[PDB]
Amino acid sequence: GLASANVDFAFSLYKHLVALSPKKNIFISPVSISMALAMLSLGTCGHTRAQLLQGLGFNLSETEIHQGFQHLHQLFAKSDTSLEMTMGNALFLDGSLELLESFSADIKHYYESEVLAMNFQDWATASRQINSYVKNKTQGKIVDLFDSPAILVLVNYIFFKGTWTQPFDLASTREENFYVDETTVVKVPMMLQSSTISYLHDSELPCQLVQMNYVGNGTVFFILPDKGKMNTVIAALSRDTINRWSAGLTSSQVDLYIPKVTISGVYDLGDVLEEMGIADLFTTQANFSRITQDAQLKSSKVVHKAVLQLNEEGTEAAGAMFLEAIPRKPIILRFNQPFIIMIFDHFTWSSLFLARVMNPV
Ligand SMILES: C[C@]12CCC(=O)C=C1CC[C@@H]1[C@@H]2[C@@H](O)C[C@@]2(C)[C@H]1CC[C@]2(O)C(=O)CO
């Protein structure tokens, strides 16, 4: 099924990226990556198609996959007083190219994708056009997404605004030490609430964790590993671990200290995808025959960018992907050191956002 395959891709992508850049702040939107690459698969055939779908975790009909993302795209459109969420897709195309009927019909039906004309000869204008488009769609959260000129650009964006069901106490906020390294300490606004919170001191892993809900169906896990045990906890991240945590989490009195995190990241997913076995996309042997017949295309660059804001009232997260194609007693829990964030949807089981916070500033 889609829900199982998507979350397994989420953790594997996270793990591989963590290993590739071990000191960087990692904040990603796996569902964004899965939806963008699944939309791409509609334009692939042969060995490239099979390799992409298998890498995404799908047992190779294709219609089941795209109906699944159509389902997600619909449920992820919300605009209320305490909950706001949007998700979308777009295709930027040079005038020299024309999409095949079935491909453009499929991306518009299943992914509600806009197909927008573009002059790749003027890259300054082109990259300005795409950057502003993404900027507006994510409510100004994703700024300056754009690397090298390209005749086709595939885009996906996600914006999320959640409100804590248990908000942090504004008066309780103080500046605390956040210990980045053995030689690095930064000052950060540290939030505090003393509430009945779902808590688990893990006995099978060197970590302690809490679960908090947002107004609606959004939920978040904050995982604090024991000092120097970040990679032992990360390697264990799976469906079986999150299930056991969910079953283990018990209502407890917690003095919960989490910092006011404002982080961003830009990630070239080239090395990550090829580590996961998705390699044909980038080769001069790439099969992109269902996109267009006006040119044989390969992928030149795959980039993801995401931003995270945490405060006393809630969370504001946003993400964007682009693909360029060219011609072929209270328990004190203090998050004052590197920790893990997992934002999920209760309703669909979708991994919305994953984080490894090395430095909240
Ligand atoms: C593994 C699981 C069910 C099987 C599956 O294919 C996908 C997932 C990933 C997300 C998990 C989910 C369930 O376990 C319920 C979880 C933990 C959910 C995230 C939040 C959740 O809904 C709860 O926290 C339950 O209250």
Residue 141 and residue 241 in one domain: no
Tell me how far the alpha carbon of residue 197 lies from the centroid of ligand 1, in angstroms: 18
Cβ–ligand 1 distance for 347 under 6 Å, the answer no
Residue 106 and residue 219 in one domain: no
Q: Looking at ligand 1, which residue's alpha carbon is closest to its atom 8?
A: 349
Atom of ligand 1 nearest to the CA of 239: 1
Tell me how far the alpha carbon of residue 278 lies from the centroid of ligand 1, in angstroms: 27
Residue 199 and residue 275 in one domain: no
User: DSSP readout, 237-255?
Assistant: -SHHHHHHHHHH-EEEEEE
Asked which of 312, 336, 351 is the last residue of a domain, the reply is 312
Residue 134 and residue 188 in one domain: no
Please choose, from the candidates 276, 324, 303, 272, the residue with its C-alpha nearest in 3D space to the C-alpha of residue 54: 276
Q: What dihedral angle (degrees, nearest 10) is formed by the CA atoms of 250, 255, 260, 261? A: -40
Q: Which residues pair with 168 in a beta bridge?
A: none
Residue 306 and residue 334 in one domain: no
Residue 169 and residue 95 in one domain: no
Residue 156 and residue 242 in one domain: no
Cβ–ligand 1 distance for 3 under 6 Å, the answer yes
Instruction: Count CB neighbours of 47 within 10 A.
Output: 12
User: DSSP readout, 47-98?
Assistant: HHHHHHHHHTT-----HHHHHHHHHHHHHT-EE-SS-EEEEEEEEEEETT--
Residue 247 and residue 342 in one domain: yes
Any idea what the CATH number is for the domain that residue 291 is in?
3.30.497.10
Please choose, from the candidates 289, 287, 285, 283, the residue with its C-alpha nearest in 3D space to the C-alpha of residue 270: 283
Residue 238 · residue 245 · CB < 8 Å: no
Domain ranges, residue 74: 1-163+259-312
Residue 224 and residue 352 in one domain: yes
Instruction: Count CB neighbours of 357 within 10 A.
Output: 23
The total of structural domains in the chain comes to: 2
Please choose, from the candidates 43, 46, 58, the residue with its C-alpha nearest in 3D space to the C-alpha of residue 280: 46
Q: Which two tokens stand for residue 231?
A: 């990679």
Would you give the DSSP letter of residue 226? P
Tell me how far the alpha carbon of residue 99 lies from the centroid of ligand 1, in angstroms: 38
Asked which of 288, 312, 336 is the last residue of a domain, the reply is 312
Q: Hey, which bits of 180-313 come out as E strands?
A: 185-201, 207-213, 218-225, 250-259, 262-268, 297-310
Q: Which residue has the tokens 């505090």?
A: 192
Cβ–ligand 1 distance for 201 under 6 Å, the answer no
**How far from 135 is each of 36, 86, 158, CA to CA, in Å?**
18, 13, 11
| 242, 244, 342, 347: residue to mutate for ligand 1 pocket, most atoms within 8 A of CB | 242
Residue 38 and residue 136 in one domain: yes
Tell me how far the alpha carbon of residue 42 lies from the centroid of ligand 1, in angstroms: 28
Q: Looking at ligand 1, which residue's alpha carbon is closest to its atom 6?
A: 4
Resolution expressed in Å: 2.3
Residue 44 · residue 37 · CB < 8 Å: no
Cβ–ligand 1 distance for 243 under 6 Å, the answer yes
Residue 9 and residue 145 in one domain: yes
Residue 252 · residue 331 · CB < 8 Å: yes
Q: Is 349 annotated as a binding residue?
A: yes
Determination method here? X-ray
Residue 168 and residue 158 in one domain: no
**Separation between Cα atoms, residue 80 and residue 105, nearest integer Å:** 31
Q: Is 243 annotated as a binding residue?
A: yes
Any idea what the CATH number is for the domain that residue 220 is in?
2.30.39.10
